[PDB]
Amino acid sequence: EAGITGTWYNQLGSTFIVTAGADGALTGTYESAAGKAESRYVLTGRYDSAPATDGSGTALGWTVAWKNNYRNAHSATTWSGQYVGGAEARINTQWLLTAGATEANGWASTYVGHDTFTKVK
Amino acid sequence: DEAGITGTWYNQLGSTFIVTAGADGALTGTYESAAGKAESRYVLTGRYDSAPATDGSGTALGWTVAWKNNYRNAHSATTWSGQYVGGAEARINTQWLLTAGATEANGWASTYVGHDTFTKVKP
Amino acid sequence: EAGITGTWYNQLGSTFIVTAGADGALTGTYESAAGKAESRYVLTGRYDSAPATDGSGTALGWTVAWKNNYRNAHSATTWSGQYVGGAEARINTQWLLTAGATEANGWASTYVGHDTFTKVK
Amino acid sequence: DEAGITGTWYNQLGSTFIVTAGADGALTGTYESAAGKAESRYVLTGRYDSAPATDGSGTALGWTVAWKNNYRNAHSATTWSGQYVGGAEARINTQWLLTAGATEANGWASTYVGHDTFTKVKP
Ligand SMILES: O=C(CCCC[C@@H]1SC[C@@H]2NC(=O)N[C@@H]21)NC1CCN(c2ccncc2)CC1
Ligand SMILES: O=C(CCCC[C@@H]1SC[C@@H]2NC(=O)N[C@@H]21)NC1CCN(c2ccncc2)CC1
Ligand SMILES: O=C(CCCC[C@@H]1SC[C@@H]2NC(=O)N[C@@H]21)NC1CCN(c2ccncc2)CC1
Ligand SMILES: O=C(CCCC[C@@H]1SC[C@@H]2NC(=O)N[C@@H]21)NC1CCN(c2ccncc2)CC1
């Protein structure tokens, strides 16, 4: 739980509050500073609870469906990446945002990007 | 769509995706990959839009598997991002990101991307 | 030049007319059945002119900037994939569409998708 | 932006991206990768928006490298998709797709995805 558990911020100022359970579980809340989002959204994910000891990062991923008590933007984002420990701990991710879409709009249903999370900002 | 998404799905690789869609918007179940450094079942967790649009749009969803179970650890995780489409054959169309634990020397090559489409029909 | 050179169609009905030069060059035109596009757009790309002989595909990629005489949608798409020969020849790709964007919109500037090209439809 | 995009660029890996932006919207030059199964320079070709927006938007562009030259063939190709931003430090922000020649058994693992950001300052 040690390294991952806590509050993280990405380059957009979004706020990633996560708890890494002993079984490999990620649970918490996400607050996006961008897009059709307000307040907190439930997140869930998984991480490698027994990572390699050769200096490589700890692989992980999590999902947010963009529905909460206030808004439903009919979309979901998954972050795929890894936690790296050290003087400047970091969660480096790439992400996919899929929106509900008709057949005619399916080609344009998915964003890709990359978020870097640190414990500052 | 609880009753629609809940069930056993298969992708074009023959992988098996056993999922339950709770009322809260949660996805829980197991994933068995027919490809790569995997064997037997792995825990998955995810989220879905529990109140989708009624205009004919699909139902957005995602889920994550960390490739560690009691038999194997491939020090990697895959996230699938996509949507459920109901109808004559319900389908789940995804794109996915597989990130492997990497060093600074290897980090540029840490992530695969691909696309899986799931149906309920056994291969 | 043999296998790749010709007219190809993807699952959206877009039309991919390409010539594969002996030096590894891809040149031709693209006509998209989707998005802010009309008529033909210039494409250029590269392919492995000496691929492996173990049965694997021939890696390739090409770019379209979405500006022609009629329209400019301030965006560019790159397809990355490979040509596979056989009874049903195929060009299997994934693609990235980046749109010109401000700092506030950068997070949402890029689509990802996948196109499969065959010599029918 | 012809004079802006034309020049020698470096990404966060130390790779060298020598490009000329023609008036037609074309990109031509050479790429030297600091990472992976590459050595010396490879041909690149691409396209860019020769008439970008004046609202503060970046200039969209893309280019392709096939990883074969006179010294090496890694049976793969990378496409970079991104945009040029001018200013105090001009920057080219990209995401990229590297596809390797694959078999049916290997096809699910054929494609890396990543992101490179280029400046003109030597590492
Ligand atoms: O804006 C949101 C939800 C908030 C997303 C926030 C994103 S998550 C990755 C990035 N990192 C963050 O921290 N924040 C941003 N959803 C819209 C997106 C645009 N939409 C479409 C529609 C059709 N096709 C494609 C896209 C409609 C739904
Ligand atoms: O093979 C697995 C675990 C099984 C994943 C199965 C994949 S999930 C998406 C697709 N859909 C499925 O149903 N099945 C496949 N994991 C890594 C280990 C090390 N790997 C890398 C890659 C890049 N850099 C470094 C190391 C390669 C793959
Ligand atoms: O529609 C086009 C150009 C035509 C693209 C056609 C695409 S190429 C991949 C797919 N395969 C095809 O055969 N056809 C489609 N460009 C728009 C896209 C939406 N735009 C934004 C703006 C801001 N952020 C993200 C996206 C504005 C520019
Ligand atoms: O290493 C290279 C050629 C050099 C590419 C350099 C890359 S371009 C994006 C990034 N930005 C840079 O500046 N440099 C790097 N090519 C393949 C060969 C076989 N590979 C696979 C992968 C997946 N499946 C099967 C085989 C791994 C990589």
Side-chain angles (χ1 to χ4, degrees), chain A residues 10-15 30-37 41 66 73-79 95-101 105 108-111 113-115 117, chain C residues 107-108 111:
Chain A
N10 68 5
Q11 75 283 355
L12 318 173
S14 312
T15 301
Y30 199 96
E31 199 183 6
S32 177
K36 310 261 170 44
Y41 297 86
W66 296 107
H74 303 312
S75 37
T77 299
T78 70
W79 292 257
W95 52 259
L96 302 166
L97 165 46
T98 303
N105 286 347
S109 70
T110 305
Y111 290 144
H114 50 99
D115 288 355
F117 292 86
Chain C
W107 70 272
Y111 290 144

mmCIF file of all heavy atoms in Angstrom, chain A residues 10-15 30-37 41 66 73-79 95-101 105 108-111 113-115 117, chain C residues 107-108 111, ligand 1:
data_model
loop_
_atom_site.group_PDB
_atom_site.id
_atom_site.type_symbol
_atom_site.label_atom_id
_atom_site.label_comp_id
_atom_site.label_asym_id
_atom_site.label_seq_id
_atom_site.Cartn_x
_atom_site.Cartn_y
_atom_site.Cartn_z
ATOM 1 N N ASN A 10 -2.130 15.303 -11.545
ATOM 2 C CA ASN A 10 -1.505 15.195 -12.854
ATOM 3 C C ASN A 10 -1.189 16.591 -13.394
ATOM 4 O O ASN A 10 -1.310 17.600 -12.692
ATOM 5 C CB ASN A 10 -2.365 14.357 -13.819
ATOM 6 C CG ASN A 10 -3.679 15.032 -14.219
ATOM 7 O OD1 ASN A 10 -3.948 16.183 -13.873
ATOM 8 N ND2 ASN A 10 -4.512 14.291 -14.960
ATOM 9 N N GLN A 11 -0.764 16.653 -14.655
ATOM 10 C CA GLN A 11 -0.331 17.919 -15.230
ATOM 11 C C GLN A 11 -1.487 18.885 -15.467
ATOM 12 O O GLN A 11 -1.245 20.089 -15.602
ATOM 13 C CB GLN A 11 0.420 17.665 -16.538
ATOM 14 C CG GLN A 11 -0.474 17.293 -17.706
ATOM 15 C CD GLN A 11 -0.958 15.849 -17.648
ATOM 16 O OE1 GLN A 11 -0.561 15.072 -16.775
ATOM 17 N NE2 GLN A 11 -1.830 15.491 -18.578
ATOM 18 N N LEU A 12 -2.726 18.393 -15.527
ATOM 19 C CA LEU A 12 -3.898 19.252 -15.663
ATOM 20 C C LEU A 12 -4.428 19.757 -14.330
ATOM 21 O O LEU A 12 -5.344 20.589 -14.317
ATOM 22 C CB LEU A 12 -5.028 18.514 -16.392
ATOM 23 C CG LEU A 12 -4.640 17.665 -17.599
ATOM 24 C CD1 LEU A 12 -5.827 16.858 -18.102
ATOM 25 C CD2 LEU A 12 -4.096 18.568 -18.694
ATOM 26 N N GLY A 13 -3.886 19.282 -13.215
ATOM 27 C CA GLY A 13 -4.397 19.649 -11.914
ATOM 28 C C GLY A 13 -5.511 18.767 -11.399
ATOM 29 O O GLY A 13 -6.055 19.050 -10.323
ATOM 30 N N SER A 14 -5.875 17.717 -12.133
ATOM 31 C CA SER A 14 -6.834 16.749 -11.631
ATOM 32 C C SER A 14 -6.276 16.066 -10.387
ATOM 33 O O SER A 14 -5.062 15.992 -10.179
ATOM 34 C CB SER A 14 -7.164 15.720 -12.710
ATOM 35 O OG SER A 14 -7.448 16.377 -13.935
ATOM 36 N N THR A 15 -7.179 15.576 -9.542
ATOM 37 C CA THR A 15 -6.803 15.048 -8.237
ATOM 38 C C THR A 15 -7.183 13.575 -8.142
ATOM 39 O O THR A 15 -8.357 13.218 -8.277
ATOM 40 C CB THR A 15 -7.452 15.853 -7.116
ATOM 41 O OG1 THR A 15 -7.029 17.219 -7.218
ATOM 42 C CG2 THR A 15 -7.033 15.295 -5.764
ATOM 43 N N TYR A 30 -11.660 10.226 -8.182
ATOM 44 C CA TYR A 30 -10.951 11.027 -9.163
ATOM 45 C C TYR A 30 -11.709 12.332 -9.354
ATOM 46 O O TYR A 30 -12.944 12.345 -9.383
ATOM 47 C CB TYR A 30 -10.814 10.272 -10.497
ATOM 48 C CG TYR A 30 -9.729 10.810 -11.407
ATOM 49 C CD1 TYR A 30 -8.463 10.235 -11.432
ATOM 50 C CD2 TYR A 30 -9.972 11.894 -12.243
ATOM 51 C CE1 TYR A 30 -7.466 10.730 -12.273
ATOM 52 C CE2 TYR A 30 -8.988 12.393 -13.078
ATOM 53 C CZ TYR A 30 -7.738 11.812 -13.089
ATOM 54 O OH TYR A 30 -6.761 12.319 -13.926
ATOM 55 N N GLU A 31 -10.972 13.430 -9.459
ATOM 56 C CA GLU A 31 -11.566 14.735 -9.731
ATOM 57 C C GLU A 31 -10.806 15.371 -10.881
ATOM 58 O O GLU A 31 -9.647 15.761 -10.718
ATOM 59 C CB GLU A 31 -11.550 15.637 -8.496
ATOM 60 C CG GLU A 31 -12.538 16.789 -8.602
ATOM 61 C CD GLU A 31 -12.491 17.740 -7.414
ATOM 62 O OE1 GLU A 31 -11.607 17.586 -6.540
ATOM 63 O OE2 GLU A 31 -13.364 18.633 -7.349
ATOM 64 N N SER A 32 -11.468 15.486 -12.030
ATOM 65 C CA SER A 32 -10.849 15.978 -13.251
ATOM 66 C C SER A 32 -10.970 17.492 -13.339
ATOM 67 O O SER A 32 -12.055 18.051 -13.156
ATOM 68 C CB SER A 32 -11.498 15.340 -14.480
ATOM 69 O OG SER A 32 -10.937 15.864 -15.667
ATOM 70 N N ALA A 33 -9.856 18.148 -13.637
ATOM 71 C CA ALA A 33 -9.874 19.573 -13.918
ATOM 72 C C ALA A 33 -10.257 19.886 -15.359
ATOM 73 O O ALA A 33 -10.310 21.064 -15.723
ATOM 74 C CB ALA A 33 -8.507 20.184 -13.601
ATOM 75 N N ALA A 34 -10.535 18.872 -16.181
ATOM 76 C CA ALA A 34 -10.856 19.077 -17.584
ATOM 77 C C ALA A 34 -12.070 18.249 -17.977
ATOM 78 O O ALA A 34 -12.367 17.219 -17.365
ATOM 79 C CB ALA A 34 -9.669 18.707 -18.489
ATOM 80 N N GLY A 35 -12.768 18.712 -19.015
ATOM 81 C CA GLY A 35 -13.857 17.957 -19.602
ATOM 82 C C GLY A 35 -15.164 18.108 -18.848
ATOM 83 O O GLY A 35 -15.293 18.866 -17.885
ATOM 84 N N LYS A 36 -16.165 17.357 -19.313
ATOM 85 C CA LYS A 36 -17.505 17.399 -18.730
ATOM 86 C C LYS A 36 -17.480 16.588 -17.437
ATOM 87 O O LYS A 36 -17.893 15.426 -17.370
ATOM 88 C CB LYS A 36 -18.543 16.883 -19.720
ATOM 89 C CG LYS A 36 -18.460 17.529 -21.102
ATOM 90 C CD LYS A 36 -19.493 18.630 -21.269
ATOM 91 C CE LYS A 36 -19.256 19.440 -22.537
ATOM 92 N NZ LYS A 36 -18.936 18.577 -23.705
ATOM 93 N N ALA A 37 -16.976 17.231 -16.385
ATOM 94 C CA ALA A 37 -16.818 16.595 -15.087
ATOM 95 C C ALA A 37 -16.912 17.650 -13.994
ATOM 96 O O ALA A 37 -16.393 18.760 -14.143
ATOM 97 C CB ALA A 37 -15.482 15.843 -14.999
ATOM 98 N N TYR A 41 -15.647 11.340 -8.755
ATOM 99 C CA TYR A 41 -16.130 10.139 -9.421
ATOM 100 C C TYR A 41 -15.450 8.918 -8.819
ATOM 101 O O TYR A 41 -14.262 8.963 -8.480
ATOM 102 C CB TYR A 41 -15.874 10.198 -10.939
ATOM 103 C CG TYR A 41 -16.627 11.322 -11.617
ATOM 104 C CD1 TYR A 41 -16.090 12.603 -11.682
ATOM 105 C CD2 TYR A 41 -17.887 11.110 -12.164
ATOM 106 C CE1 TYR A 41 -16.781 13.641 -12.292
ATOM 107 C CE2 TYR A 41 -18.593 12.141 -12.771
ATOM 108 C CZ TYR A 41 -18.037 13.407 -12.832
ATOM 109 O OH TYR A 41 -18.735 14.440 -13.430
ATOM 110 N N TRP A 66 -17.771 8.317 -16.082
ATOM 111 C CA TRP A 66 -18.050 9.719 -15.792
ATOM 112 C C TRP A 66 -19.510 9.969 -15.425
ATOM 113 O O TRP A 66 -20.170 10.843 -16.003
ATOM 114 C CB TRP A 66 -17.611 10.572 -16.980
ATOM 115 C CG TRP A 66 -16.133 10.464 -17.158
ATOM 116 C CD1 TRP A 66 -15.466 9.795 -18.146
ATOM 117 C CD2 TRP A 66 -15.130 10.994 -16.282
ATOM 118 N NE1 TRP A 66 -14.110 9.898 -17.950
ATOM 119 C CE2 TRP A 66 -13.876 10.630 -16.815
ATOM 120 C CE3 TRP A 66 -15.171 11.759 -15.108
ATOM 121 C CZ2 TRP A 66 -12.672 11.004 -16.216
ATOM 122 C CZ3 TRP A 66 -13.973 12.129 -14.512
ATOM 123 C CH2 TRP A 66 -12.742 11.749 -15.066
ATOM 124 N N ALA A 73 -21.701 12.095 -18.226
ATOM 125 C CA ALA A 73 -21.166 12.427 -19.541
ATOM 126 C C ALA A 73 -21.028 11.210 -20.451
ATOM 127 O O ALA A 73 -20.262 11.267 -21.421
ATOM 128 C CB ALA A 73 -19.810 13.127 -19.408
ATOM 129 N N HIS A 74 -21.731 10.120 -20.145
ATOM 130 C CA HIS A 74 -21.810 8.920 -20.985
ATOM 131 C C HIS A 74 -20.455 8.557 -21.589
ATOM 132 O O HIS A 74 -20.286 8.459 -22.806
ATOM 133 C CB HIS A 74 -22.859 9.096 -22.081
ATOM 134 C CG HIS A 74 -24.222 9.418 -21.561
ATOM 135 N ND1 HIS A 74 -24.808 8.717 -20.530
ATOM 136 C CD2 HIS A 74 -25.113 10.372 -21.924
ATOM 137 C CE1 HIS A 74 -26.005 9.222 -20.282
ATOM 138 N NE2 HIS A 74 -26.212 10.228 -21.112
ATOM 139 N N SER A 75 -19.478 8.366 -20.706
ATOM 140 C CA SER A 75 -18.121 8.060 -21.132
ATOM 141 C C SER A 75 -17.357 7.464 -19.961
ATOM 142 O O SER A 75 -17.751 7.596 -18.800
ATOM 143 C CB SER A 75 -17.400 9.301 -21.665
ATOM 144 O OG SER A 75 -17.763 10.461 -20.930
ATOM 145 N N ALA A 76 -16.246 6.817 -20.286
ATOM 146 C CA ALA A 76 -15.389 6.191 -19.292
ATOM 147 C C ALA A 76 -13.941 6.353 -19.720
ATOM 148 O O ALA A 76 -13.633 6.269 -20.910
ATOM 149 C CB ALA A 76 -15.723 4.706 -19.122
ATOM 150 N N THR A 77 -13.059 6.581 -18.747
ATOM 151 C CA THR A 77 -11.626 6.692 -18.985
ATOM 152 C C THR A 77 -10.899 5.583 -18.237
ATOM 153 O O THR A 77 -11.207 5.303 -17.076
ATOM 154 C CB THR A 77 -11.083 8.058 -18.532
ATOM 155 O OG1 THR A 77 -11.719 9.101 -19.278
ATOM 156 C CG2 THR A 77 -9.573 8.137 -18.758
ATOM 157 N N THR A 78 -9.948 4.936 -18.906
ATOM 158 C CA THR A 78 -9.053 3.992 -18.254
ATOM 159 C C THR A 78 -7.630 4.517 -18.371
ATOM 160 O O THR A 78 -7.197 4.904 -19.460
ATOM 161 C CB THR A 78 -9.159 2.584 -18.861
ATOM 162 O OG1 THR A 78 -8.607 2.574 -20.189
ATOM 163 C CG2 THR A 78 -10.615 2.127 -18.905
ATOM 164 N N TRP A 79 -6.923 4.562 -17.246
ATOM 165 C CA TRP A 79 -5.503 4.879 -17.221
ATOM 166 C C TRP A 79 -4.711 3.588 -17.089
ATOM 167 O O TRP A 79 -5.010 2.759 -16.224
ATOM 168 C CB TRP A 79 -5.151 5.811 -16.060
ATOM 169 C CG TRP A 79 -5.693 7.222 -16.167
ATOM 170 C CD1 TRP A 79 -4.997 8.336 -16.523
ATOM 171 C CD2 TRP A 79 -7.024 7.662 -15.860
ATOM 172 N NE1 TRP A 79 -5.810 9.444 -16.475
ATOM 173 C CE2 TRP A 79 -7.062 9.058 -16.073
ATOM 174 C CE3 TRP A 79 -8.193 7.009 -15.451
ATOM 175 C CZ2 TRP A 79 -8.218 9.811 -15.887
ATOM 176 C CZ3 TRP A 79 -9.341 7.760 -15.248
ATOM 177 C CH2 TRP A 79 -9.347 9.148 -15.472
ATOM 178 N N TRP A 95 -3.847 6.934 -21.365
ATOM 179 C CA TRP A 95 -5.254 6.722 -21.049
ATOM 180 C C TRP A 95 -6.087 6.688 -22.326
ATOM 181 O O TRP A 95 -5.689 7.216 -23.370
ATOM 182 C CB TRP A 95 -5.788 7.785 -20.067
ATOM 183 C CG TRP A 95 -5.553 9.238 -20.436
ATOM 184 C CD1 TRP A 95 -4.580 10.076 -19.939
ATOM 185 C CD2 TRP A 95 -6.323 10.024 -21.355
ATOM 186 N NE1 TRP A 95 -4.697 11.329 -20.507
ATOM 187 C CE2 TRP A 95 -5.761 11.322 -21.374
ATOM 188 C CE3 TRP A 95 -7.434 9.756 -22.165
ATOM 189 C CZ2 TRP A 95 -6.274 12.343 -22.172
ATOM 190 C CZ3 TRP A 95 -7.943 10.767 -22.948
ATOM 191 C CH2 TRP A 95 -7.359 12.048 -22.953
ATOM 192 N N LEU A 96 -7.239 6.018 -22.226
ATOM 193 C CA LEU A 96 -8.240 5.955 -23.287
ATOM 194 C C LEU A 96 -9.581 6.419 -22.738
ATOM 195 O O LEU A 96 -10.076 5.867 -21.752
ATOM 196 C CB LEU A 96 -8.395 4.537 -23.841
ATOM 197 C CG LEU A 96 -7.164 3.844 -24.413
ATOM 198 C CD1 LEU A 96 -7.488 2.371 -24.571
ATOM 199 C CD2 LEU A 96 -6.772 4.461 -25.758
ATOM 200 N N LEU A 97 -10.182 7.403 -23.383
ATOM 201 C CA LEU A 97 -11.512 7.871 -23.004
ATOM 202 C C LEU A 97 -12.470 7.474 -24.118
ATOM 203 O O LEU A 97 -12.361 7.982 -25.236
ATOM 204 C CB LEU A 97 -11.501 9.378 -22.772
ATOM 205 C CG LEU A 97 -12.822 10.146 -22.704
ATOM 206 C CD1 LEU A 97 -13.819 9.443 -21.819
ATOM 207 C CD2 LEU A 97 -12.559 11.538 -22.171
ATOM 208 N N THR A 98 -13.392 6.559 -23.823
ATOM 209 C CA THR A 98 -14.412 6.138 -24.779
ATOM 210 C C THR A 98 -15.752 6.771 -24.412
ATOM 211 O O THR A 98 -16.158 6.757 -23.242
ATOM 212 C CB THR A 98 -14.555 4.611 -24.825
ATOM 213 O OG1 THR A 98 -13.295 4.008 -25.140
ATOM 214 C CG2 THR A 98 -15.555 4.198 -25.895
ATOM 215 N N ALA A 99 -16.435 7.319 -25.408
ATOM 216 C CA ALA A 99 -17.763 7.876 -25.214
ATOM 217 C C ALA A 99 -18.792 6.966 -25.866
ATOM 218 O O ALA A 99 -18.529 6.334 -26.889
ATOM 219 C CB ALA A 99 -17.858 9.286 -25.802
ATOM 220 N N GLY A 100 -19.973 6.875 -25.247
ATOM 221 C CA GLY A 100 -21.068 6.188 -25.904
ATOM 222 C C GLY A 100 -21.325 6.785 -27.278
ATOM 223 O O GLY A 100 -21.284 7.999 -27.469
ATOM 224 N N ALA A 101 -21.550 5.914 -28.255
ATOM 225 C CA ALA A 101 -21.600 6.387 -29.627
ATOM 226 C C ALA A 101 -22.521 5.509 -30.458
ATOM 227 O O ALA A 101 -22.695 4.321 -30.177
ATOM 228 C CB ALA A 101 -20.197 6.419 -30.252
ATOM 229 N N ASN A 105 -20.983 7.371 -35.503
ATOM 230 C CA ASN A 105 -20.007 8.155 -34.764
ATOM 231 C C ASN A 105 -18.940 7.294 -34.101
ATOM 232 O O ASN A 105 -18.047 7.839 -33.441
ATOM 233 C CB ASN A 105 -20.717 9.009 -33.703
ATOM 234 C CG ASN A 105 -21.449 10.198 -34.303
ATOM 235 O OD1 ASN A 105 -21.250 10.544 -35.467
ATOM 236 N ND2 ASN A 105 -22.306 10.829 -33.505
ATOM 237 N N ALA A 108 -15.100 8.021 -34.074
ATOM 238 C CA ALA A 108 -14.618 9.163 -33.308
ATOM 239 C C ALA A 108 -14.935 9.040 -31.820
ATOM 240 O O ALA A 108 -14.991 10.052 -31.117
ATOM 241 C CB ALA A 108 -15.217 10.455 -33.865
ATOM 242 N N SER A 109 -15.134 7.825 -31.322
ATOM 243 C CA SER A 109 -15.618 7.659 -29.960
ATOM 244 C C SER A 109 -14.523 7.696 -28.900
ATOM 245 O O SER A 109 -14.859 7.739 -27.713
ATOM 246 C CB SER A 109 -16.380 6.337 -29.839
ATOM 247 O OG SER A 109 -15.488 5.239 -29.944
ATOM 248 N N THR A 110 -13.238 7.670 -29.271
ATOM 249 C CA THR A 110 -12.176 7.396 -28.302
ATOM 250 C C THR A 110 -11.066 8.437 -28.374
ATOM 251 O O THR A 110 -10.481 8.656 -29.439
ATOM 252 C CB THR A 110 -11.594 5.991 -28.514
ATOM 253 O OG1 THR A 110 -12.649 5.022 -28.467
ATOM 254 C CG2 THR A 110 -10.587 5.664 -27.419
ATOM 255 N N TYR A 111 -10.765 9.057 -27.234
ATOM 256 C CA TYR A 111 -9.575 9.885 -27.059
ATOM 257 C C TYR A 111 -8.429 9.041 -26.514
ATOM 258 O O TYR A 111 -8.641 8.107 -25.737
ATOM 259 C CB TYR A 111 -9.821 11.023 -26.063
ATOM 260 C CG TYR A 111 -10.736 12.139 -26.508
ATOM 261 C CD1 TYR A 111 -11.583 12.760 -25.598
ATOM 262 C CD2 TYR A 111 -10.735 12.601 -27.817
ATOM 263 C CE1 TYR A 111 -12.425 13.797 -25.985
ATOM 264 C CE2 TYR A 111 -11.572 13.646 -28.207
ATOM 265 C CZ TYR A 111 -12.414 14.232 -27.291
ATOM 266 O OH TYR A 111 -13.244 15.257 -27.673
ATOM 267 N N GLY A 113 -4.530 9.863 -24.603
ATOM 268 C CA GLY A 113 -3.638 10.871 -24.070
ATOM 269 C C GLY A 113 -2.687 10.254 -23.065
ATOM 270 O O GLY A 113 -2.627 9.035 -22.912
ATOM 271 N N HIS A 114 -1.937 11.111 -22.376
ATOM 272 C CA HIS A 114 -1.007 10.638 -21.358
ATOM 273 C C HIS A 114 -1.027 11.588 -20.173
ATOM 274 O O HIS A 114 -0.923 12.807 -20.349
ATOM 275 C CB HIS A 114 0.414 10.514 -21.915
ATOM 276 C CG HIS A 114 0.881 11.734 -22.645
ATOM 277 N ND1 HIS A 114 1.690 12.688 -22.062
ATOM 278 C CD2 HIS A 114 0.641 12.165 -23.906
ATOM 279 C CE1 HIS A 114 1.934 13.648 -22.936
ATOM 280 N NE2 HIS A 114 1.311 13.353 -24.063
ATOM 281 N N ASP A 115 -1.151 11.021 -18.975
ATOM 282 C CA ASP A 115 -1.142 11.765 -17.722
ATOM 283 C C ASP A 115 0.029 11.315 -16.864
ATOM 284 O O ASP A 115 0.291 10.112 -16.734
ATOM 285 C CB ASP A 115 -2.439 11.556 -16.926
ATOM 286 C CG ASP A 115 -3.639 12.266 -17.536
ATOM 287 O OD1 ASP A 115 -3.475 13.002 -18.528
ATOM 288 O OD2 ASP A 115 -4.758 12.075 -17.011
ATOM 289 N N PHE A 117 1.382 11.658 -12.977
ATOM 290 C CA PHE A 117 0.918 11.989 -11.638
ATOM 291 C C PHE A 117 2.099 12.133 -10.689
ATOM 292 O O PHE A 117 2.990 11.278 -10.662
ATOM 293 C CB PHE A 117 -0.056 10.926 -11.122
ATOM 294 C CG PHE A 117 -1.361 10.900 -11.863
ATOM 295 C CD1 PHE A 117 -1.495 10.155 -13.026
ATOM 296 C CD2 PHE A 117 -2.449 11.634 -11.411
ATOM 297 C CE1 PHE A 117 -2.694 10.132 -13.722
ATOM 298 C CE2 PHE A 117 -3.650 11.620 -12.101
ATOM 299 C CZ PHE A 117 -3.773 10.863 -13.259
ATOM 300 N N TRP C 107 -5.607 18.306 -23.897
ATOM 301 C CA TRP C 107 -5.909 16.986 -23.356
ATOM 302 C C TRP C 107 -6.842 16.198 -24.267
ATOM 303 O O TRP C 107 -6.819 14.961 -24.259
ATOM 304 C CB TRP C 107 -6.530 17.129 -21.967
ATOM 305 C CG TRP C 107 -7.911 17.701 -22.018
ATOM 306 C CD1 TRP C 107 -8.257 19.024 -21.993
ATOM 307 C CD2 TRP C 107 -9.136 16.968 -22.118
ATOM 308 N NE1 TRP C 107 -9.624 19.157 -22.067
ATOM 309 C CE2 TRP C 107 -10.187 17.909 -22.142
ATOM 310 C CE3 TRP C 107 -9.448 15.606 -22.185
ATOM 311 C CZ2 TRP C 107 -11.527 17.530 -22.232
ATOM 312 C CZ3 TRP C 107 -10.781 15.231 -22.273
ATOM 313 C CH2 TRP C 107 -11.802 16.188 -22.297
ATOM 314 N N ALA C 108 -7.665 16.893 -25.055
ATOM 315 C CA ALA C 108 -8.681 16.278 -25.897
ATOM 316 C C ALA C 108 -8.348 16.384 -27.382
ATOM 317 O O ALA C 108 -9.248 16.313 -28.223
ATOM 318 C CB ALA C 108 -10.045 16.915 -25.621
ATOM 319 N N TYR C 111 -7.678 11.607 -31.275
ATOM 320 C CA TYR C 111 -8.466 10.382 -31.393
ATOM 321 C C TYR C 111 -7.545 9.194 -31.642
ATOM 322 O O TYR C 111 -6.509 9.319 -32.301
ATOM 323 C CB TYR C 111 -9.449 10.455 -32.565
ATOM 324 C CG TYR C 111 -10.624 11.393 -32.419
ATOM 325 C CD1 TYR C 111 -11.112 12.086 -33.521
ATOM 326 C CD2 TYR C 111 -11.270 11.565 -31.203
ATOM 327 C CE1 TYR C 111 -12.199 12.946 -33.410
ATOM 328 C CE2 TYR C 111 -12.365 12.421 -31.089
ATOM 329 C CZ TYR C 111 -12.817 13.108 -32.191
ATOM 330 O OH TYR C 111 -13.892 13.957 -32.081
HETATM 331 O O1 LIG E 1 -15.298 15.135 -20.755
HETATM 332 C C1 LIG E 1 -15.658 13.990 -20.483
HETATM 333 C C2 LIG E 1 -15.401 13.345 -19.131
HETATM 334 C C3 LIG E 1 -14.172 13.930 -18.451
HETATM 335 C C4 LIG E 1 -12.886 13.429 -19.098
HETATM 336 C C5 LIG E 1 -11.633 14.008 -18.445
HETATM 337 C C6 LIG E 1 -10.333 13.487 -19.055
HETATM 338 S S1 LIG E 1 -9.876 11.804 -18.484
HETATM 339 C C7 LIG E 1 -8.288 11.997 -19.348
HETATM 340 C C8 LIG E 1 -7.807 13.408 -18.981
HETATM 341 N N1 LIG E 1 -7.138 13.411 -17.696
HETATM 342 C C9 LIG E 1 -7.812 14.139 -16.742
HETATM 343 O O2 LIG E 1 -7.469 14.295 -15.578
HETATM 344 N N2 LIG E 1 -8.938 14.660 -17.330
HETATM 345 C C10 LIG E 1 -9.074 14.310 -18.727
HETATM 346 N N3 LIG E 1 -16.313 13.221 -21.381
HETATM 347 C C11 LIG E 1 -16.624 13.744 -22.708
HETATM 348 C C12 LIG E 1 -15.384 13.771 -23.620
HETATM 349 C C13 LIG E 1 -15.781 14.247 -25.018
HETATM 350 N N4 LIG E 1 -16.853 13.399 -25.547
HETATM 351 C C14 LIG E 1 -16.723 12.643 -26.696
HETATM 352 C C15 LIG E 1 -17.832 12.313 -27.502
HETATM 353 C C16 LIG E 1 -17.642 11.536 -28.633
HETATM 354 N N5 LIG E 1 -16.460 11.054 -29.042
HETATM 355 C C17 LIG E 1 -15.407 11.364 -28.275
HETATM 356 C C18 LIG E 1 -15.474 12.130 -27.124
HETATM 357 C C19 LIG E 1 -18.072 13.354 -24.743
HETATM 358 C C20 LIG E 1 -17.760 12.914 -23.309
#
